[PDB]
Curated annotation (Swiss-Prot), chains A, B:
Annotated disorder: Corneal dystrophy, gelatinous drop-like: A form of lattice corneal dystrophy, a class of inherited stromal amyloidoses characterized by pathognomonic branching lattice figures in the cornea. GDLD is an autosomal recessive disorder characterized by severe corneal amyloidosis leading to blindness. Clinical manifestations, which appear in the first decade of life, include blurred vision, photophobia, and foreign-body sensation. By the third decade, raised, yellowish-gray, gelatinous masses severely impair visual acuity.
Name under which the protein is recorded: Tumor-associated calcium signal transducer 2
GO biological process: negative regulation of branching involved in ureteric bud morphogenesis; negative regulation of cell motility; negative regulation of epithelial cell migration; negative regulation of ruffle assembly; negative regulation of stress fiber assembly; negative regulation of substrate adhesion-dependent cell spreading; positive regulation of stem cell differentiation; regulation of epithelial cell proliferation
Extracellular topological domain: 1-236
Keywords, sorted A to Z: Amyloid, Amyloidosis, Corneal dystrophy, Disulfide bond, Glycoprotein, Membrane, Sensory transduction, Signal, Transmembrane, Transmembrane helix, Tumor antigen, Vision
Function: May function as a growth factor receptor.
Post-translational modification summary for this protein: The N-terminus is blocked.
Family statement drawn from the similarity comment of this UniProt entry: Belongs to the EPCAM family.
Disulfide-bond pairs as recorded: 41-76, 87-93, 95-113
Cellular component GO terms, alphabetical: basal plasma membrane; cytosol; extracellular exosome; extracellular space; lateral plasma membrane; membrane; nucleus
Tissue specificity note: Placenta, pancreatic carcinoma cell lines.
Membrane topology: Single-pass type I membrane protein
Whole sequence portion shown: 33 to 268 of 323
Amino acid sequence: NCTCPTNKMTVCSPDGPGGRCQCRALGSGMAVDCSTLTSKCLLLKARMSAPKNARTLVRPSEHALVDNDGLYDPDCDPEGRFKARQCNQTSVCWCVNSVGVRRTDKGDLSLRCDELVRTHHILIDLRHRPTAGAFNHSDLDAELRRLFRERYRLHPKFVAAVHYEQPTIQIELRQNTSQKAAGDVDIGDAAYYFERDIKGESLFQGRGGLDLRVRGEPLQVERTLIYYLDEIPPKF
Amino acid sequence: NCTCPTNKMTVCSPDGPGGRCQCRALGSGMAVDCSTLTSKCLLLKARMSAPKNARTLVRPSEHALVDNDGLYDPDCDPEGRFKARQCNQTSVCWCVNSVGVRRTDKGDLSLRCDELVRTHHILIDLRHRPTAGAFNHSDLDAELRRLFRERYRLHPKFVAAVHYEQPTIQIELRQNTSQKAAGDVDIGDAAYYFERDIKGESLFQGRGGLDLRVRGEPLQVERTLIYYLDEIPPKF
Ligand SMILES: *[C@@H]1O[C@H](CO)[C@@H](O)[C@H](O)[C@H]1NC(C)=O
Ligand SMILES: *[C@@H]1O[C@H](CO)[C@@H](O)[C@H](O)[C@H]1NC(C)=O
């Protein structure tokens, strides 16, 4: 059955040699490894994706803005990760980090981003709809570390810590470039998948969002904040 | 068995969901369709491909030149075809047709190639090593139309004509945009596969070169000339 479980934003078909199941990335057309997480850049491209022939639809405008200014259509290198320079505009350019947020001040078409700066620490701040009381910190740590271990296939050594107090929860992810091995999922990719699941727009095939139950009681998260820390501080 | 019969310039491995076979294009990392022909642009990216870590290998000198002046690493749009504007890396840019050869005078980074011009007529001019006599026009016509029908998976109507005289053979392919349907292989891609099989660098898995036998008598080709005709004439 032609599926891409880890990335639903794909188009597959049994149009392969001997009925083989080919599958490609929505929008970008890039190759997708459906066993593991797809890089955040290709998923962003698939998010915008500019439908091929609207026919009866209407486009977005030259002046129509969206809620999130950090939403755009990036250019992804032949490995899947972002390119160091993202010029989605007429002549306006800038430099981005691994997770795809802006690292410099907007320049022109003569800009030159040398290296793709690595976002090595990520802090995910969640706040859940207040239940009658608070949970136990141990169960929350167990559930969240298990989530990144199994669901997003992030190695347990990359979950630096989990902090809990009244409603507001925090999750630390620490992945240096020196401690990233062959075929390891990126904490940026895992954080993107986790924010999409938390916000009910999961990239997996079967699911629709995130269940996130802690010892029988569910956990519905109102507010989410995600901070990205780069090895080289951005130059503003 | 993880194999791509139509594109040998790919990297497959059974690391797909439940041991599924995923394959991706060399050099570009783009998704490939291994049942049919891959676009000439992705194969052009694969041809040069700048090996990932030379270690003991090298990079060709910045003053070193190659036999063909029209070989370069192109930018391929999401669908696989060439981007209308090609800039190898520098402040020199130009516009191309669908087959990738140049159309306009070399300019600068402000160039605006408004549309991707189609190549609608392709003429292949072969000259074979002289045997004791010539062949029959009928057998040559049948064999070449059969080769483009079965092997390159080109619909028979797109092979406009076949001409024969003393050694020199000609093949005329004709394909407008109006007569290209859903999932029709392009005359550019079929011609590129033909010219890689003619020169002994076949893009198929099992084969290495073109057998090209006409009623038994093997046909070895010395010289090949392939002319590309664009719907809009190239402006120089
Ligand atoms: C480029 O960014 C602008 C915001 O400055 C946005 O309106 C537009 O949709 C983006 N387009 C692409 C192709 O990323
Ligand atoms: C263009 O790319 C080709 C790739 O083979 C390379 O050999 C050539 O030197 C490049 N030329 C320029 C001007 O960048």
